[PDB]
Amino acid sequence: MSDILQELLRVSEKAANIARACRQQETLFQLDFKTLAAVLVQEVIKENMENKFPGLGKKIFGEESNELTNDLGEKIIMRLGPTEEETVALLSKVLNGNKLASEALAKVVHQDVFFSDPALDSVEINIPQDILGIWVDPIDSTYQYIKGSADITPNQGIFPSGLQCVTVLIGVYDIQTGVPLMGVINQPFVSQDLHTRRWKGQCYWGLSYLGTNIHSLLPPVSVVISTSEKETRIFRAAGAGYKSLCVILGLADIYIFSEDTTFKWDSCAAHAILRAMGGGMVDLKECLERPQLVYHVGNQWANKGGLIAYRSEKQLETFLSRLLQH
Ligand SMILES: O=P(O)(O)O[C@H]1[C@H](O)[C@@H](O)[C@H](OP(=O)(O)O)[C@@H](O)[C@H]1O
Ligand SMILES: [Ca+2]
Numbered sequence: 153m154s155d156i157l158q159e160l161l162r163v164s165e166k167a168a169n170i171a172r173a174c175r176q177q178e179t180l181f182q183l184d185f186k187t188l189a190a191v192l193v194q195e196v197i198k199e200n201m202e203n204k205f206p207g208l209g210k211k212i213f214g215e216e217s218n219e220l221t222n223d224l225g226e227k228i229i230m231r232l233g234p235t236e237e238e239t240v241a242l243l244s245k246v247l248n249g250n251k252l253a254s255e256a257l258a259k260v261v262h263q264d265v266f267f268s269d270p271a272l273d274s275v276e277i278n279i280p281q282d283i284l285g286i287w288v289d290p291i292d293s294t295y296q297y298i299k300g301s302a303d304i305t306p307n308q309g310i311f312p313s314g315l316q317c318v319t320v321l322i323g324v325y326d327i328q329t330g331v332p333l334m335g336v337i338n339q340p341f342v343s344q345d346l347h348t349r350r351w352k353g354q355c356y357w358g359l360s361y362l363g364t365n366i367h368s369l370l371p372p373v374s375v376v377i378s379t380s381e382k383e384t385r386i387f388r389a390a391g392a393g394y395k396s397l398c399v400i401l402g403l404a405d406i407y408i409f410s411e412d413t414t415f416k417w418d419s420c421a422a423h424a425i426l427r428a429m430g431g432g433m434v435d436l437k438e439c440l441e442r443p444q445l446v447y448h449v450g451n452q453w454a455n456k457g458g459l460i461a462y463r464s465e466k467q468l469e470t471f472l473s474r475l476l477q478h
């Protein structure tokens with residue numbers, strides 16, 4: 153429902169805050185750290201949603217485990233809190249007792265966020281909690297996150313690489329039918345002030361429930377196609393979330409992926425937002441033999457057969473016609 157969606161936006165901003173903190177504070181920029189940040193962000197999302205909506209916390213699935221393996225080989229189960237002290241203790245257990253890295257992490261983990269949207273505040277939609285499943289990618293395009301390029305110049309509005317390709321993806325789907333219902337995409341690194349080195353982000357939301365379709369306000373902007381960097385008119389770009397975003401905003405009309413290296417958490421949130429706009433994601437191999445992606449049944453959680461992401465079915469039929477006449 154709209155309430156759950158507002159909470160998801162809030163925790164998306166907290167996740168973006170953790171992601172930015174790990175690269176803009178010197179002690180965190182010091183420092184496997186990428187999976188540490190990913191597992192931490194996923195756990196922050198999960199625990200916030202469980203605390204605000206009891207019973208939801210078990211329904212939140214993601215790319216990361218909640219277990220980590222420190223330098224000694226100890227398995228540590230990630231449970232934060234109940235407040236900052238035990239979080240600093242747990243982080244000192246994972247980070248070999250580096251006290252100020254632990255303290256900075258717990259400081260931005262437990263820091264309250266009051267990020268809202270007046271558009272979604274008046275929307276009053278209720279959805280029974282028992283039917284909701286959640287796929288979460290805490291940090292999409294991890295290689296661009298660690299690479300940290302800030303100076304990349306886009307091509308026709310599309311960044312081929314850089315921190316702009318990093319996203320936090322939170323998708324909600326129907327447990328029984330497998331249809332995506334709700335979507336949040338957080339872009340933590342959209343704009344950087346050259347003189348303060350501070351990054352401004354963006355967030356996009358969508359909802360598609362029983363014939364009702366709402367979405368966040370989009371900025372104003374033959375076919376334009378986005379492909380990934382290792383895919384084997386047409387632009388290359390990093391990030392599954394980011395390419396779906398290019399389709400959402402209209403920077404591109406089709407996003408094709410022919411490999412089987414995406415998963416439900418890569419595509420769920422974006423699929424829901426696209427669905428709220430008349431678009432969707434279809435199974436690529438299924439269309440070529442002549443079928444929307446579902447999120448309740450696995451194979452394991454990979455989107456086997458690749459995908460096409462589209463905002464307008466007009467463009468999809470045009471493209472498939474021209475495509476398989478060769
Ligand atoms: O950048 P591409 O070429 O679109 O490749 C995508 C990449 O962006 C991420 O979505 C990646 O997940 P992750 O970054 O979370 O490991 C996914 O597995 C790759 O297939
Ligand atoms: Ca990821």
Ligand SMILES: [Ca+2]
Pocket residue numbers: 289291292293392418
């Ligand atoms: Ca991913």
